[PDB]
Ligand binder design. Structure first.
Ligand SMILES: Nc1ncnc2c1ncn2[C@@H]1O[C@H](COP(=O)(O)OP(=O)(O)NP(=O)(O)O)[C@@H](O)[C@H]1O
Ligand SMILES: [Mg+2]
Ligand SMILES: [Zn+2]
Lengths: 188, 55, 533, 161, 299, 96
């Protein structure tokens, strides 16, 4: 019935779909305030009451839908700037086991905004693309150290992103399950 | 970087019999069959470095 | 002094920054190589030129000096992307610059990057070179170390910690080494000027470029062209290499299985063999059995039971060539053989030695002989052992050895030697003018059912998957028939060595169907086809 | 050239000009001229190839002009070998008398290129040449009552090829 | 930018050798023309073995000095018109291209990208797929396809040049009083001229040659090629033109001519092309059609 | 300079002659004529075309090549076979 590759996990398309439901801040280039939108899964007042160059908050999928056309501009999140990413890299280097406290959707949102909204950043984009890479590489080192503690009981993780978890899910759970089977078989 | 003059039609000829010590450092013109040939190698031109072919 | 640091800084910033679209291709490649414990990087010239032409200019002017700087830059990046120890990484290059024919290389090209191509003709064994090396000072017993790199060195004489004129020795107990190999490249056959034998070069490679090619292969090479010491003021040239260029699926066996359940498969394979040859039905049937073979067996008391088939043919030239093409492994020869070894083997001379003919060389496959009557005197007696035992044994001039001869023989000619074969037949002809006209029209066309490769792969699959056994009904049938023929001959010879041949034919017939058991259906066709006479 | 080729009987005149010092033996002159001009090579990557070279063999009674016409061909032809097939590449090869030598010729007639290996080394060479050979028929005199095989010391595929 | 055939790809030597203008200026169809090119590179101070190197890998010093070398040397060969200005585009690290090179890539993809009525149909349908094979190359995300287009462009120009030399050396151009006639009865592969665009490229080659070979007699030209499957000749009518460096424009008159003979004629012919200057006619009917055409005053 | 080619008209006759020669060879019990001989006939015809600088082979080239190869083939045989061959082959060795 359901496809074989969706029995236990989410595909990256579903991960993008999940991230798209979050709110984001925009500057509209038109006034809607005095037809009306009449949505059923969100607030409707914000879109009906827009005024040009007045900041407002909407779901990300509608924000990208507007930015497709002239009608809108997207404000970048404050963590997505050179100063903050510098500090997070320094945190990563300083604490050789803890993960730095980046938001749960950082990879997905960065790789959406760099494609759909390359024109709306303040920093030069060719530097952000480097610092995002540095963060992902350091985190991958820390992941490879952690896979030596798979065990029969449990594990704790902190600040690991959704896409990063979903990348690893079928390996961690499978090896952990087999260690559990081997151990309990000796008890019985 | 450099050009070589080739002389042609030198008006006197020897076989490999008639050569004597008086011919030393003189120009000569000779005829025969080529019996054996080596491979080509580079050779140091000046004694920064430069080379030339040799056989 | 500072130039060595600026150059290293430049290549370090190259690896960390080269994007084409959205992927940092050299950072990703360098990380993915370390995970499989491959310490090298394959850079492409065109990307280096695109990034900054000045770097390529420096590299193009002085390659012997600048290649080591780029290699150490790679190591410095490799640590950042994987550590919060590693050897020095090997740089490898790809290029599309114009090829130089091997015959045109000369004194203008010494210490330049050169791209060329040819055929490899020889390969040395591996040998050891030093990279990190430790030193002991004989007088004071002080110690130090040195770092070699392999570009165009000797032990030093500045003694330390008087300390003497030449006091240094090597501690092999605390030093590091790498692999090195030599190769020979010969110019392309379709380039050579007429009436001359081809020219060749010698060349060197180390670490991951070693053990990558074999003799007889055509290759393309990127490397530094240089000279070494070995007339007056004269030296030998060579090349330092920096890069080189040169079972079934499920969907396959499904076709073979569909063929296996076809009700007329035997007819189909017979029809597919030498289709131009008219008539000769039973000849084609026998060649199918020769290609498929029986089943090998081994018993508790160690006796060993043969699997091969042997056939003799008394037009006939075409079939042996066809068998040579369709068979998975094949050898073709005329009765005098390729050397004084003849068909089987012989001793030659100065010390004596031994060499095998075209029975030993075809071991494991099929061999076909084009005129069996032109067999030499020694081979006439030696083929008895080669066929009955599947071996050849010699004890002459102090040599004492035994050789393997595990093969199926096809033979043709135009006596007691016929007893060695399982089946014998005489080729037959027909003289239809349309056939000759068709052949002639095809000859003019070139001058102006199952295909071979599919059939060869199918034969391979069947030989690998199945080895069938006689059912009890077949045993009663065969034994009754055997005693019947001997009784008929007695009241008017058949012998066990022919019963054991009929069994092999029966198994080979069951093998086409992939049936694990042989049945009376196969026994009937086996005795029907046994009418050699 | 085109003027003389436009004239009738140019083929016969070329044959007549062949080997002037030797009387008679017009068929031999015809065959030698045909070998010196030769055909065109062709190939079909679908399973076949055809050489352009033409090979000729002459069975000679003692003193019937064979060695003289070979000397004549040697002076006439552009490149040639007289008796080494590497030196005969895209040329004519001449044999005036006759096991390893015959074995080499067996390989040479089967192939158009030669391959060899020694001490693990492997290499290839080109033959690509027309072969003109002559022989003495198994002693002092030919016997016309018998087929050719009785009068020669050659394998059957030689007479085929 | 230089009126040199694809300068930034292949080599400097090939850029001059296959240039449509250089062939008319130095007569490259024969050795007395080719030696002029060797002579030029020798005087310019460029070693001839480096002039044949791939232009990306050619030495940096020559690359930057080339702009001055041409100012000192093209005058002596009457070849100063090579110099001009044009537009160049580059994106990131992947290297420059000019508009002049881009359109040749596009055109090449048009030409070579991958009873009688059905065959005609099949051919016409194949030519439409190349539209999309061209369309998809207008996108910066698909540079891979553009490189393929360039590789095809080089082969097309090579094959064109190897036919032009045969036409001139065998003197197949027939010099009638009113116009110049040329007909290809055979060739190394005559199929390439079955597409209109390719035929036009060959015509453009011959027109430069005819424009520079003599000062006199600017004439119309007619070019035709046979097809063995249809037994029809594909025919094109071509104007003269004035040299590059030299004033109303001229007008192509073949349209009316072709129209009128078509309206009159017994002959089996086709007119369906957007460019009316291009027609098709069966094998036996070419000579009566051309006879009626030359008899007409419309030329 | 010269690289001749065959003409496709008379090749039907060549195929018929090849078949006829094979039939006659078998009928007298001779060793048979083969594809090698046919290839040699075409190659010799090309050489004859080349001799006059002709880029086309012609019927007389094929006739001369046929005569040369047939006569050579006849010379290899035993005497009784030779007489039967020349009596039948008269329309090739002398006529055409
Ligand atoms: N027209 C001719 N016909 C026959 N012989 C001739 C003719 N003109 C000269 N001769 C001589 O006859 C011989 C020609 O045959 P040739 O084969 O060269 O001699 P040969 O080599 O000694 N015999 P052989 O050793 O069996 O090849 C030479 O001695 C020639 O000088
Ligand atoms: Mg002689
Ligand atoms: Zn000391």
């Amino acid at each position: 019935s359901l496809p074989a590759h969706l029995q236990q996990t989410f595909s990256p398309e579903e991960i993008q779909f999940i991230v798209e439901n979050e709110p984001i801040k925009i500057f509209p280039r038109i006034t809607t305030r005095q037809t009306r939108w009449q949505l059923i899964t969100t607030d409707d007042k914000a879109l009906n009451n827009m005024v040009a160059m007045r900041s407002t908050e909407v779901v990300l999928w509608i924000a990208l839908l507007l930015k497709q056309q002239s009608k809108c501009s997207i404000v970048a999140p404050q963590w997505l700037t050179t100063k903050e990413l510098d500090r997070k890299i320094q945190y990563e280097k300083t604490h050789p086991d803890r993960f730095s406290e980046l938001p749960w959707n950082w990879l997905v949102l960065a790789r959406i905004l760099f494609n759909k909204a390359k024109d709306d950043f303040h920093d030069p984009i060719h530097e952000l693309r480097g610092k995002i890479q540095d963060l992902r590489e350091i985190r991958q080192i820390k992941v490879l150290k952690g896979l030596k503690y798979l065990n029969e009981s449990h594990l704790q993780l902190d600040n690991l992103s959704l896409l990063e978890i979903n990348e690893l899910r079928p390996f961690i759970t499978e090896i952990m399950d087999k260690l559990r089977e081997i151990h309990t078989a000796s008890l019985t | 970087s450099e050009i070589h003059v080739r002389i042609s039609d030198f008006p006197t000829i020897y076989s490999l019999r008639e050569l004597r010590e008086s011919n030393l450092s003189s120009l000569v013109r000779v005829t025969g069959v080529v019996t054996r040939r080596t491979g080509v190698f580079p050779q140091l031109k000046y004694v920064k470095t430069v080379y030339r072919n040799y056989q | 002094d500072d130039d060595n640091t600026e150059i290293i800084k430049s290549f370090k910033n190259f690896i960390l920054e080269f994007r084409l679209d959205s992927q940092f291709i050299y950072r990703d490649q360098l990380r993915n190589n370390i995970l499989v414990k491959n310490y090298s990087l394959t850079v492409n010239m065109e990307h280096l030129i695109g990034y900054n032409e000045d770097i390529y200019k420096k590299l193009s002017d002085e390659p012997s000096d600048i290649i080591p700087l780029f290699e150490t830059a790679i190591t410095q990046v490799a640590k950042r992307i994987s550590i919060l120890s590693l050897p020095t990484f090997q740089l490898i290059l790809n290029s599309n610059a114009n090829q130089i024919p091997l015959r045109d290389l000369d004194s203008e090209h010494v210490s330049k990057i050169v791209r060329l191509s040819g055929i490899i003709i020889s390969t040395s064994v591996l040998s050891s070179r030093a990279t990190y090396l430790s030193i002991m000072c004989r007088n004071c017993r002080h110690t130090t170390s040195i770092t070699i790199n392999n570009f165009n060195v000797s032990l030093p004489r500045s003694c330390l910690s008087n300390c003497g004129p030449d006091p240094y020795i090597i501690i092999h107990e605390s030093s590091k080494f790498i692999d090195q190999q030599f190769l020979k490249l010969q110019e392309i056959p379709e380039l050579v000027p007429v009436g001359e034998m081809p020219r060749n070069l010698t060349m060197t490679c180390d670490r991951y470029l070693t053990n990558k090619v074999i003799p007889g292969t055509r290759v393309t090479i990127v490397g530094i062209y240089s000279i070494y010491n070995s007339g007056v003021a004269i030296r030998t040239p060579y090349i330092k290499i920096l890069g080189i260029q040169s079972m079934f699926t499920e969907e396959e066996e499904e076709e073979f299985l569909q063929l296996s359940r076809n009700p007329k498969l035997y007819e189909i394979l017979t029809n597919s063999i030498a289709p131009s040859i008219f008539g000769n039905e039973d000849i084609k049937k026998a060649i199918v059995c020769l290609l498929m073979g029986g089943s090998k067996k081994i018993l508790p008391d160690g006796m060993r039971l043969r699997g091969d088939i042997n056939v003799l043919l008394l037009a006939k030239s075409q079939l042996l060539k066809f068998v040579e093409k369709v068979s998975p492994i094949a050898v073709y020869t005329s009765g005098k053989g390729s050397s004084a070894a003849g068909l089987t083997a012989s001793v030659q001379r100065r010390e004596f030695y031994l060499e095998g003919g075209a029975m030993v060389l075809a071991d494991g496959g099929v061999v076909c002989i084009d005129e069996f009557d032109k067999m030499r005197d020694e081979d006439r007696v030696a083929i008895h052992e080669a066929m009955e035992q599947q071996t050849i044994s010699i004890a002459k001039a102090g040599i004492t050895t035994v050789l393997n001869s595990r093969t199926s023989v096809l033979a043709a000619a135009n006596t007691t030697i016929l007893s060695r074969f399982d089946m014998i037949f005489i080729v037959k002809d027909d003289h239809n003018e349309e056939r000759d006209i068709s052949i002639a029209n095809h000859v003019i066309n070139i001058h102006t059912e199952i295909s071979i490769e599919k059939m060869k792969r199918y034969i391979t699959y069947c030989r690998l998957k199945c080895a069938p056994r006689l059912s009890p009904q077949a045993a009663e049938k065969l034994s009754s028939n055997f005693v019947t023929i001997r009784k008929q001959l007695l009241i008017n010879p058949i012998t066990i060595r022919q019963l054991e041949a009929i069994i092999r034919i029966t198994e080979s017939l069951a093998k086409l169907e992939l049936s694990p058991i042989a049945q009376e259906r196969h026994v009937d066709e086996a005795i029907r086809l046994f009418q050699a006479s | 050239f085109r003027k003389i080729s436009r004239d009738r009987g140019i083929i016969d005149k070329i044959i007549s000009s062949m080997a002037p010092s030797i009387y008679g033996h017009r068929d031999i002159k015809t065959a030698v001229a045909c070998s010196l001009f030769g055909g065109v090579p062709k190939n079909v990557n679908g399973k076949h190839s055809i050489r352009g070279d033409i090979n000729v063999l002459l069975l000679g009674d003692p003193g019937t002009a064979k060695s003289q016409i070979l000397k004549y061909v040697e002076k006439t032809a552009h490149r040639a070998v007289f008796a080494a097939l590497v030196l005969a590449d895209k040329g004519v090869c001449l044999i005036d008398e006759f096991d390893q030598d015959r074995t080499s010729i067996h390989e040479a007639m089967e192939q158009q290129s030669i391959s060899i290996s020694k001490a693990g080394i492997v290499t290839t060479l080109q033959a690509r040449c027309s072969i003109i050979a002559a022989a003495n028929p198994n002693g002092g005199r030919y016997n016309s009552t018998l087929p050719l095989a009785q009068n020669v010391s050659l394998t059957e595929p030689i007479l085929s090829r | 930018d230089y009126y040199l055939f694809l300068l930034r790809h292949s080599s400097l030597y090939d850029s001059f050798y296959y240039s449509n203008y250089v062939n008319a200026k130095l007569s490259l169809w024969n050795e007395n023309g080719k030696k002029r090119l060797h002579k030029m590179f020798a005087r310019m101070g460029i070693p001839l073995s480096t002039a044949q190197e791939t232009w990306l890998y050619m030495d940096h010093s020559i690359k930057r000095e080339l702009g001055i070398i041409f100012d000192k040397n093209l005058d002596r060969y009457g070849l100063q018109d090579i110099i001009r200005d044009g537009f160049v585009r580059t994106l990131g690290y992947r290297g420059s291209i000019s508009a002049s090179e881009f359109v040749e890539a596009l055109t090449a993809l048009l030409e070579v990208g991958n009873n009688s009525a059905q065959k005609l149909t099949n051919l016409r349908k194949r030519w439409v797929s190349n539209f999309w094979l061209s369309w998809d190359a207008l996108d910066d995300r698909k540079v891979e396809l553009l490189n393929r287009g360039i590789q095809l462009a080089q082969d097309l120009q090579r094959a064109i040049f190897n036919t032009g030399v045969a036409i001139l050396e065998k003197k197949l151009i027939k010099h009638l009083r009113i116009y110049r006639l040329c007909v290809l009865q055979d060739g190394p592969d005559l199929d390439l001229y079955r597409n209109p665009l390719t035929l036009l490229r060959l015509g453009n080659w011959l027109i430069e040659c005819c424009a520079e070979s003599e000062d006199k007699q600017l004439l119309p030209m007619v070019l035709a090629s046979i097809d063995e499957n249809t037994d029809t000749y594909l025919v094109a009518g071509l104007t003269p033109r004035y040299p590059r460096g030299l004033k109303k424009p001229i007008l192509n008159n073949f349209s009316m001519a072709f129209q009128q003979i078509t309206a009159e004629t017994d002959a089996k012919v086709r007119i369906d092309n957007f460019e009316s200057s291009i027609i098709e006619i069966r094998r036996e009917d070419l000579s009566p059609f051309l006879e009626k055409l030359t008899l007409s005053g419309l030329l | 300079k010269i690289y001749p080619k065959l003409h496709q008209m008379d090749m039907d006759k060549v195929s018929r002659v090849y078949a006829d020669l094979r039939r006659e060879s078998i009928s007298t019990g001779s060793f048979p004529i083969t594809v090698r001989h046919l290839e040699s006939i075409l190659r010799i015809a090309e050489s004859f075309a080349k001799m006059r600088l002709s880029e086309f082979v012609s019927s007389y080239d094929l006739d001369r090549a046929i005569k040369v190869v047939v006569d050579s083939f006849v010379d290899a045989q035993k005497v009784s076979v030779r007489r039967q061959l020349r009596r039948s082959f008269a329309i090739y060795t002398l006529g055409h």
